[PDB]
UniProtKB/Swiss-Prot annotation, chain A:
<feature type="region of interest" description="Sufficient for general mitochondrial translation">
    <location>
        <begin position="17"/>
        <end position="66"/>
    </location>
</feature>
<comment type="subunit">
    <text>Component of the mitochondrial large ribosomal subunit (mt-LSU). Mature yeast 74S mitochondrial ribosomes consist of a small (37S) and a large (54S) subunit. The 37S small subunit contains a 15S ribosomal RNA (15S mt-rRNA) and 34 different proteins. The 54S large subunit contains a 21S rRNA (21S mt-rRNA) and 46 different proteins.</text>
</comment>
<protein>
    <recommendedName>
        <fullName>Large ribosomal subunit protein bL31m</fullName>
    </recommendedName>
</protein>
<comment type="function">
    <text>Component of the mitochondrial ribosome (mitoribosome), a dedicated translation machinery responsible for the synthesis of mitochondrial genome-encoded proteins, including at least some of the essential transmembrane subunits of the mitochondrial respiratory chain. The mitoribosomes are attached to the mitochondrial inner membrane and translation products are cotranslationally integrated into the membrane. Overexpression of bL31m suppresses mutations in the COX2 leader peptide-encoding and initiation codon regions.</text>
</comment>
<comment type="similarity">
    <text>Belongs to the bacterial ribosomal protein bL31 family. Highly divergent.</text>
</comment>
From Swiss-Prot, chain B:
<protein>
    <recommendedName>
        <fullName>Large ribosomal subunit protein bL33m</fullName>
    </recommendedName>
</protein>
<dbReference type="GO" id="GO:0003735">
    <property type="term" value="F:structural constituent of ribosome"/>
</dbReference>
<dbReference type="InterPro" id="IPR038584">
    <property type="entry name" value="Ribosomal_bL33_sf"/>
</dbReference>
<dbReference type="GO" id="GO:0005743">
    <property type="term" value="C:mitochondrial inner membrane"/>
</dbReference>
<keyword id="KW-0689">Ribosomal protein</keyword>
Curated annotation (Swiss-Prot), chain D:
<dbReference type="GO" id="GO:0005739">
    <property type="term" value="C:mitochondrion"/>
</dbReference>
<comment type="function">
    <text>Component of the mitochondrial ribosome (mitoribosome), a dedicated translation machinery responsible for the synthesis of mitochondrial genome-encoded proteins, including at least some of the essential transmembrane subunits of the mitochondrial respiratory chain. The mitoribosomes are attached to the mitochondrial inner membrane and translation products are cotranslationally integrated into the membrane.</text>
</comment>
<keyword id="KW-0496">Mitochondrion</keyword>
<keyword id="KW-0689">Ribosomal protein</keyword>
<keyword id="KW-0687">Ribonucleoprotein</keyword>
Curated annotation (Swiss-Prot), chain G:
<comment type="subunit">
    <text>Component of the mitochondrial large ribosomal subunit (mt-LSU). Mature yeast 74S mitochondrial ribosomes consist of a small (37S) and a large (54S) subunit. The 37S small subunit contains a 15S ribosomal RNA (15S mt-rRNA) and 34 different proteins. The 54S large subunit contains a 21S rRNA (21S mt-rRNA) and 46 different proteins. Unlike bacterial L5, uL5m does not bind zinc.</text>
</comment>
<dbReference type="InterPro" id="IPR022803">
    <property type="entry name" value="Ribosomal_uL5_dom_sf"/>
</dbReference>
<comment type="function">
    <text>Component of the mitochondrial ribosome (mitoribosome), a dedicated translation machinery responsible for the synthesis of mitochondrial genome-encoded proteins, including at least some of the essential transmembrane subunits of the mitochondrial respiratory chain. The mitoribosomes are attached to the mitochondrial inner membrane and translation products are cotranslationally integrated into the membrane.</text>
</comment>
<dbReference type="Pfam" id="PF00281">
    <property type="entry name" value="Ribosomal_L5"/>
</dbReference>
<dbReference type="GO" id="GO:0005739">
    <property type="term" value="C:mitochondrion"/>
</dbReference>
RNA sequence: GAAAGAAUUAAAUUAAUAUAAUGGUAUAACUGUGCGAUAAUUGUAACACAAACGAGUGAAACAAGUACGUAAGUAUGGCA
RNA sequence: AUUGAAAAAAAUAAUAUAUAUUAUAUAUAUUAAUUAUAAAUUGAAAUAUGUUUAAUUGAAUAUAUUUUAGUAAUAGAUAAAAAUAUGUACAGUAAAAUUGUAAGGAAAACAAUAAUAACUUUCUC
C-alpha cells in the first residue's frame, strides 16, 4: 500500500573521514525588472537570467515610485 | 514452544558442547567461547542440522 | 508542445487554434492574428516552433489580457449588479437561469455551473 | 523492477547524494600547508579588527546618544519626552533596498508619490 | 577543487537537443588506457570527471550586460549629484555665509512640534518640496555644543529616499566620510566622526 | 620589513633550509615543493591556485603587525611583559611556524628550534599542553601517584626519562610503562624542559625518584622509598639533559638503587618528581642548599615533609612501574642487595 | 556486569585532561573542521555576503538609534519563585514554578552597541503529508529544498502516531534545512526580490506572527515555490511542488525588534501589531 | 569594549529505562556513537545475606583464555 | 629512477625496509589511498590509427581499444523518529508546557523559551 524505495545496506562513513557536501554551483547573473544586475550562486546551469516580475517593479516594494 | 535448545559443538575435535537456547528460526549460530579440554578459546558451530528462515542476501553491490 | 506559458500543448498541433484551446484569455480571431504579428507560417504545428520563437509567443500573451485573469473581471461584473439589487444576482447566486431561460424545467445547466465564481 | 516515477525519484536522490560525485581529498605539502595557515590566520585577525572597529563605532554612537538625551532632559522636558517614545511598530522604508551587485538603468528617482 | 561533479544526467535528459549543445560546449577527461605512462598519476574518473582535479563546466533571448559601477557624475566629480558614488554612503553637507561647511542647522524657536519632524519640515522648505526624506528615529544621534554662543545643536538622523535638494546657505554637497574631513573643520569632524558610516 | 632583519633578532626565527625559504617567498607559483622529494610525485602535485599573491599580502600584514609590536616590546622594562610582547610579534611568522611544526621538539637542534627564544618556548609549551601534559596528568591520577606521594601537581616543566646505560636501546619512557628489571638495572637520564620564563643562571633544581609501594609488614601497609635523589642541578632551556656528565657526586643525596620488586608484593610505582629551588634575592650566583644526609632515610621517606623542610615546589613529574620478574634476583646480586622476599599469592 | 552503580571519582589536579587527544584512534578527527588537514574542511568565507554587508553599513546603526530608550534598565522575566521560609516543610522544597508560565522566561535587556538585533538562522521546515502514502514524495521535497538553498537538507520523520490522519510513527515525511551565514542571507535576498513579489495577493508577513522572543515565521504554498529560479529553470522536474514553513531566528530580545530588523531587509509587514 | 572558549549555578530522575510496582538513575543505569559480538567463558570459590531442610541472593579472591580501552582499566549477561 | 617547471637531511604519524634488547626500539627512505568492489546492444567521453582544410594543425569522421554512466540517501563520534536489549570506550541531555508558523485544526512537523561571577584566549580604545 505504502509506496517506497527499499533501502540497500548503508555505506559506513568512518569517523574523521566524513566530508562536507559541497554541491556544484555556478555564478549566475540575475538582471531584475530594471537593469540592476545581481550575482548569485546557483545549482542550475544558467549563467544569465533576466526577471520580469520582481520587487523592483512591484507596487508594494516601491509605493513612492497570453 | 517459541524457544528451543541446540548443541553448539567445538571446532577442536574435543566433544565439548555448550548447549544454548535459541528461537525457532535461529540464524545458524556460531559462537567463539572457551574449550576447557583444549585449554583455548575456539568457535562453536551447531551440531544437529536444523533450518533457517529464507534470509535474503544483503545487496552490498548495486544490481538489477 | 513543451511547457509554453506553463500549460503548454503537443506537437503536430497547428498553433493557430492550439492557443484558442489551452489559453482562456485568447481564442478564435485573437489567437489567429496573435500568430500573425509573430509572423509564423499558418497551418504550422507546435513541434516546428523554434523555442526562441515561443519566447515571443509568451510575451505576446502577456501584452493582452489572458488566463483566469479575465475570469475574475467577469466574476466582478457578475458580483457587481449581484451586489446591487439585480434579478441576475439572485438568478446567479441561487444557481438559476441568469439568461431568464427555462427555470421551470431545463435549468439543471444553470444550477450545474451558474454560481458566484461561475467559470470554475 | 522499477517504474519511470521510481527511476526519476532515484535520479533526484542521486542529485543530493555524495555517491560517486566527490573528488579526492585536498592534500597539501608542508610548505603549502603553512602558507595556507598564514593566509587563514591573517584573514581571521583582519575580520576581528573589522568587528572591533564596527563595535567601537557603535559604542561611540550609543555614548553620543546618551549624552544628547541627558542634555535634552536637562533643557526641554517636552522635547525629551518626544524623543524618548516607544518605536515598537517602526518599519524601515521600502525604498531603502539591499544594495545590488550592479546598479539599475535609472540610478536615482527625482520624483515620487 | 573540492566541489562535487556536476550531475548533468539530471539537468540534461539523454537523447535531447539541449543536452547535445552542453556536451559540445564541454570537453571530456583523459581516461586510463593500458600500456601507457601517465606521469600525473592514473586517471581516477567517475561520472566523467578527473577526481584528482578541479572540474570546469562551460555553459527575451538577450545577453545580460551589467551597467558600469562608476558613473558620469563620478567621472566629472559633481559633488551636488546623488549618483556620483554608488558603493558608498553619501551625507548632505552645507556651506553657510562664512567659509565653513557643516551639517544643516535650524533654529527651533517654537518648541511645540517634535524635533525630528521640525527638522524634516525645514529640509522640505529648503528644497521647495523636491526632497523625500525618512527619519530613522525621534531620538537625536548627538549634540554640538559651545560656550561662545550659548547654544545646543541636537543632531537628528534621516534618510534621503527619492528627490533633489538644490536649495541661509550658499552652497551644498553630497560627500563620503573621507571627503567630509577635507571639507569640514578638524574639531567639528572629531565631534561628528563616529556618527558617519565608513562605507 | 622586520622579519627579514636579523641584526637584533635571533637566527632561529629564519628557516635554515634555503630551498624551502625560496619556495615560500616567490613571485609566481613556478617552483615545486622541497617536501615532495620524488620527481614523479612533484610532477603529479598541483598546489591550489592564486595562493602566492594572497600569501604575500598576508605576510606583509602580519609582518607589519610584528613590527608594530616590536615598537612596544623595546620600550617595555619588566621581563615577563617583554617576553609576551616578543611572542606576540613573532608567533604568526610563517618561518618560525615551519621550524617548530616540522622538526623535533624533544631533541631540538638549537639552530632550528631555540628554546632560548621566547616564541619557540611558548610554542613548545602549547604543544606540551595539547597532548603530553594531559597524558602525564592522567597517568598520575589513575595510578594514584599524586595523593599517595605528593598532594597535587601543577605541571610546568615537561619531564622525560630514559634508561640508556642498562641495555643499549634508545627509548623515551611513556608515563605509566611496565619496564623490566634489566631495563631499569642502571640509572635513568632525565630531560627537564622548562617553558616558563625563569632565571637560568640562578635557578637550581632537585630530582627525586620515589617508590611508594614497598611493603612494611609491621604496619601491615606500605612505605615510601627514595630510590634516586639529586639536588642543586643547573638547567638551561637547550642544555637540559640530566646525565652523569652534568651533575657531580656532591649533587647525589641518594644514589640510584634499582627497582627490585618482590614476588607477589605487586606492581610498584616509581614516580620521579622534579622540584625547582627557592630563589633568594640580594645574592649573585646559584644559591645552594645543604641536606642533612643522616636525617633523610631511604628505606622510609616522607616526601612531603622533605619538600616542606627545603621549601621546594614540584614543577614536573614522570612515572614508570615495575613488578617482579626472573632477573630481579640477578639485579639484587649485582647491586649486593639481599636475596629478596617472597610473599603469598593470596592477599588474605 | 557486577553492578550498575555510576560514581565518578574525584581527582587531585586542576589540569583538564582531554581524553580524545590521548588516544591514537581518530587522527583525522583531532583536527578542527576549520583546519585544511581535516577531511571535513570546507571553504567558508568564499565571497562577500551582500545582505550582511548592508546590515553592517546602513541598518545596524539605525536599529541601535531606534532601540535607544533613555536610562532603560533590565526587565527580568518570569522565573521560578522560591518559598518563603514560614514553615519547616519549605526547607528542601523545590521552588514554585513561574507565575503565568510553567517554563521560565528570559530577561529582556536594553539594546546597546553589543546586543543589536540581527539575523541568526533560517530554518525551512517542509513536512509533506501525502508522503504518509508515498515515501518518494519526501525525497522530491528534500531535493526541492536543496535546490532552493544550495544546502544539504535533513530528513523529517513522523515522530507521533494518530489514526484520524493516516499517519504512522517512524516514517520519512518531507525535510528541513537550517541555513546559517551567507547561504541563509542569499536565501533571504532571493525571497525578498524574486519569490515574494511574484505571489499575487501578498500583503506581507503578519505582525501577529512570531515567538515572544526574537523569532518570526511564515509559509509558502506549492504555487509559490515555482517562482524560485532553480525550480523555474526546470519546472518540468517540479510538477508536484511542496509548500514549506520558514522559521527566521533573530538575535532580537523581543519580537517587534525582530520585525523591524526584517523590514530593514525589505520584508513587508501588514497585520495589526500586538 | 568585543568575540570565543572553557564552562558554573540553577532546574530536572515529571522524559526515559526490554515489561508490572516499588526502589535507583543526569556522577547518569537514560541517550548517541566507534569498535566489537567477546565475559550470554572455564576450573577451585572464602565469606557473608537469607535460611528448617532442599533451595535461593551478593561475592573478595586463585587460575585459563577472550573482548574493548592511550591508559586507569571494565566485562563471569541485561539498573535491581 | 625516465618528462614538466627552473651537495642532502632534520618534527608527528603512516607505510617501506632493515637491525638492537630475557626494553613494542631505533636507522635510512617516501609521503599512497581516504565513499570504493562484478554484472550495462544502446548513454557519454579519452586515447591510437583512417578523409578534407593552412609535410603540416584544426575539423569532421570511421575501427579497435578502453574509460566512464548500474546514477540511492548517514558526510555526523550523529544524540529522545524507527531500527539489536550482552561487552567496552567516548560524548550529550530529556519531557512537559506557552508565543508561534502553507494547508494546520484539540490532536502532523518545525522554531524559540534560566543565570553569566569568575577564569582563559584574541582583537582593540
Amino acid at each position: 500500500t505504502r509506496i517506497t524505495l527499499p533501502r540497500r545496506p548503508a555505506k559506513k562513513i568512518q569517523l574523521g573521514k566524513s566530508r562536507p557536501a559541497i554541491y556544484h554551483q555556478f555564478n549566475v547573473k540575475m538582471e531584475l525588472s530594471d537593469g540592476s544586475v545581481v550575482i548569485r550562486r546557483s545549482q542550475y546551469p544558467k549563467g544569465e537570467i533576466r526577471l520580469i516580475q520582481d520587487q523592483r517593479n512591484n507596487p508594494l516594494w516601491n509605493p513612492s515610485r497570453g | 514452544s517459541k524457544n528451543s535448545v541446540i548443541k553448539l559443538l567445538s571446532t577442536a575435535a574435543s566433544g565439548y558442547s555448550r548447549y544454548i537456547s535459541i528461537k525457532k528460526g535461529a540464524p545458524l549460530v556460531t559462537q567463539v567461547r572457551y574449550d576447557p579440554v583444549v585449554k583455548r578459546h575456539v568457535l562453536f558451530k551447531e551440531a544437529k542440522k536444523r533450518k533457517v528462515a529464507e534470509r535474503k542476501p544483503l545487496d552490498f553491490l548495486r544490481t538489477a | 508542445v513543451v511547457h509554453i506559458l506553463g500549460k503548454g500543448f503537443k506537437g503536430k498541433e497547428v498553433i493557430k487554434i492550439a492557443l484558442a484551446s489551452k489559453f482562456y484569455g485568447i481564442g478564435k480571431t485573437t489567437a489567429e492574428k496573435i500568430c500573425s504579428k509573430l509572423g509564423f507560417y499558418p497551418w504550422m504545428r507546435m513541434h516546428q516552433l523554434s523555442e526562441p520563437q515561443i519566447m515571443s509567443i509568451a510575451s505576446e500573451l502577456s501584452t493582452m489580457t489572458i488566463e483566469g485573469d479575465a475570469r475574475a473581471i467577469v466574476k466582478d461584473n457578475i458580483a457587481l449588479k449581484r451586489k446591487i439589487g439585480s434579478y441576475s444576482g439572485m438568478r446567479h447566486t441561487l444557481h438559476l437561469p441568469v439568461r431568464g431561460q427555462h427555470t421551470r424545467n431545463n435549468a439543471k445547466t444553470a444550477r450545474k455551473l451558474n454560481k458566484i465564481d461561475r467559470r470554475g | 523492477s522499477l517504474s519511470p516515477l521510481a527511476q526519476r525519484v532515484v535520479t533526484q536522490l542521486s542529485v543530493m547524494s555524495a555517491s560517486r560525485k566527490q573528488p579526492k581529498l585536498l592534500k597539501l605539502a608542508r610548505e603549502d600547508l603553512i602558507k595556507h595557515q598564514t593566509i587563514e590566520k591573517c584573514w581571521s585577525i583582519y575580520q576581528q579588527q573589522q568587528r572591533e572597529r564596527r563595535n567601537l563605532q557603535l559604542e561611540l554612537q550609543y555614548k553620543s546618544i546618551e549624552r544628547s538625551m541627558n542634555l535634552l532632559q536637562e533643557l526641554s522636558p517636552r522635547l525629551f519626552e518626544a524623543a524618548n517614545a516607544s518605536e515598537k511598530g517602526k518599519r524601515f522604508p521600502m525604498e531603502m533596498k539591499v544594495p545590488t551587485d550592479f546598479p539599475p538603468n535609472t540610478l536615482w528617482h527625482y520624483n515620487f508619490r | 577543487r573540492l566541489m562535487w561533479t556536476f550531475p548533468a544526467y539530471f539537468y540534461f535528459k539523454k537523447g535531447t537537443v539541449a543536452e547535445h549543445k552542453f556536451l559540445s560546449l564541454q570537453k571530456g577527461p583523459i581516461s586510463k588506457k593500458n600500456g601507457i605512462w601517465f606521469p600525473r598519476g592514473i586517471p581516477d574518473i567517475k561520472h566523467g570527471r578527473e577526481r584528482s582535479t578541479k572540474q570546469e563546466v562551460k555553459l527575451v533571448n538577450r545577453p545580460v550586460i551589467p551597467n558600469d559601477r562608476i558613473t558620469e557624475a563620478d567621472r566629472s566629480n559633481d559633488m551636488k549629484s546623488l549618483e556620483r558614488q554608488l558603493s558608498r554612503t553619501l551625507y548632505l553637507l552645507v556651506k553657510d555665509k562664512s567659509g565653513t561647511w557643516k551639517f544643516p542647522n535650524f533654529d527651533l524657536s517654537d518648541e511645540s512640534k517634535p524635533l525630528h519632524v521640525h527638522a524634516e519640515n525645514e529640509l522640505k522648505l529648503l528644497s521647495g518640496d523636491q526632497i523625500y526624506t525618512w527619519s530613522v528615529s525621534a531620538t537625536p544621534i548627538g549634540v554640538l555644543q559651545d560656550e561662545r554662543n550659548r547654544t545646543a545643536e541636537f543632531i537628528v538622523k534621516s534618510h534621503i529616499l527619492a528627490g533633489k535638494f538644490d536649495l541661509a546657505f550658499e552652497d551644498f554637497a553630497w560627500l563620503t566620510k573621507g571627503e567630509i574631513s577635507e571639507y569640514v573643520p578638524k574639531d567639528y569632524f572629531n565631534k561628528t566622526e563616529f556618527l558617519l558610516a565608513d562605507n | 620589513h622586520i622579519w627579514s632583519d636579523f641584526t637584533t633578532r635571533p637566527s632561529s626565527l629564519s628557516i635554515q633550509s634555503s630551498k624551502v625559504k625560496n619556495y615560500l617567498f616567490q613571485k609566481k607559483a613556478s617552483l615545486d615543493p622541497p617536501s615532495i622529494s620524488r620527481r614523479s610525485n612533484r610532477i603529479k602535485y598541483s598546489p591550489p591556485e592564486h595562493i602566492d599573491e594572497i600569501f604575500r599580502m598576508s605576510y606583509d600584514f602580519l609582518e607589519q603587525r610584528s613590527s608594530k609590536f616590536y615598537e612596544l616590546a623595546n620600550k617595555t622594562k619588566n621581563p615577563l611583559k617583554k617576553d609576551a610582547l616578543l611572542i606576540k610579534a613573532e608567533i604568526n611568522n610563517p618561518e618560525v611556524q615551519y621550524n617548530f611544526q616540522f622538526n623535533n621538539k624533544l631533541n631540538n637542534v638549537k639552530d632550528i628550534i631555540d628554546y632560548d627564544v621566547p616564541v619557540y618556548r611558548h610554542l613548545g609549551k602549547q604543544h606540551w599542553e595539547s597532548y603530553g601534559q594531559m597524558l602525564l596528568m592522567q597517568r598520575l591520577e589513575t595510578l594514584a601517584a599524586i595523593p599517595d606521594t605528593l598532594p597535587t601537581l601543577v605541571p610546568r616543566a615537561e619531564v622525560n626519562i630514559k634508561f640508556p646505560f642498562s641495555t643499549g636501546v634508545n627509548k623515551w619512557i611513556e608515563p605509566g610503562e611496565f619496564l623490566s628489571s634489566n631495563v631499569t638495572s642502571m640509572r635513568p637520564i632525565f630531560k627537564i624542559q622548562e617553558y616558563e620564563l625563569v632565571n637560568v643562571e640562578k635557578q637550581l633544581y632537585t630530582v627525586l625518584i620515589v617508590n611508594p609501594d614497598v611493603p612494611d609488614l609491621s604496619n601491615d601497609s606500605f612505605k615510601t622509598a627514595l630510590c634516586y635523589g639529586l639536588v642543586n642541578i643547573n638547567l638551561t632551556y637547550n642544555d637540559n639533559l640530566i646525565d652523569p656528565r652534568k651533575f657531580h657526586s656532591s649533587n647525589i643525596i641518594a644514589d640510584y638503587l634499582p627497582p627490585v620488586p618482590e614476588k607477589n608484593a605487586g606492581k610498584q610505582r616509581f614516580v620521579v618528581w622534579v622540584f625547582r629551588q627557592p630563589l633568594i634575592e640580594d645574592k649573585q650566583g646559584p644559591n645552594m642548599l645543604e641536606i642533612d644526609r643522616k636525617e633523610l632515610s631511604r628505606d622510609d621517606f616522607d616526601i612531603r615533609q622533605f619538600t616542606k623542610k627545603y621549601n621546594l615546589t614540584a614543577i614536573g613529574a614522570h612515572i614508570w612501574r615495575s613488578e617482579w620478574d626472573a632477573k630481579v634476583a640477578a639485579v639484587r646480586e649485582k647491586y649486593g642487595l639481599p636475596p629478596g622476599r617472597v610473599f603469598s599469592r593470596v592477599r588474605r | 556486569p557486577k553492578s550498575a552503580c555510576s560514581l565518578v571519582k574525584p581527582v587531585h589536579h586542576l589540569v583538564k585532561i582531554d581524553k580524545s587527544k590521548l588516544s591514537p584512534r581518530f587522527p583525522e578527527l583531532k583536527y578542527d573542521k576549520s583546519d585544511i588537514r581535516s577531511p571535513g574542511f570546507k571553504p567558508k568565507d568564499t565571497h562577500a555576503d551582500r545582505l550582511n554587508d548592508h546590515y553592517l553599513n546602513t541598518l545596524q546603526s539605525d536599529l541601535l538609534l531606534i532601540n535607544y530608550s533613555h536610562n532603560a534598565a533590565v526587565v527580568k522575566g518570569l522565573k521560578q519563585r522560591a518559598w518563603s521560609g514560614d514553615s519547616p516543610y519549605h526547607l528542601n522544597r523545590p521552588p514554585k514554578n513561574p507565575r503565568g508560565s510553567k517554563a521560565q522566561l528570559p530577561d529582556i535587556h536594553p539594546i546597546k552597541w553589543s546586543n543589536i538585533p540581527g539575523l541568526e538562522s533560517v530554518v525551512i521546515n517542509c513536512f509533506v503529508r501525502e508522503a504518509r502514502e508515498n515515501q518518494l514524495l519526501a525525497i522530491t521535497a528534500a531535493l526541492q529544498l536543496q535546490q532552493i538553498t544550495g544546502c544539504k537538507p535533513h530528513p523529517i520523520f513522523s515522530k507521533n502516531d494518530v489514526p484520524t490522519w493516516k499517519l504512522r510513527k517512524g516514517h520519512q515525511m518531507g525535510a528541513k534545512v537550517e541555513l546559517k551565514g551567507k547561504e541563509m542571507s542569499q536565501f533571504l535576498s532571493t525571497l525578498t526580490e524574486i519569490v515574494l513579489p511574484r505571489i499575487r495577493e501578498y500583503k506581507g508577513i503578519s505582525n501577529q506572527s512570531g515567538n515572544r522572543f526574537g523569532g518570526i515565521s511564515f509559509g509558502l504554498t506549492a504555487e509559490d515555490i515555482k517562482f524560485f529560479p532553480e525550480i523555474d529553470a526546470n519546472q518540468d522536474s517540479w510538477p508536484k511542488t511542496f509548500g514549506m514553513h520558514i522559521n527566521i531566528n533573530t538575535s532580537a530580545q523581543l519580537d517587534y525588534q525582530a520585525r523591524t530588523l526584517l523590514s530593514g531587509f525589505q520584508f513587508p509587514f501588514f497585520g495589526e501589531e500586538k
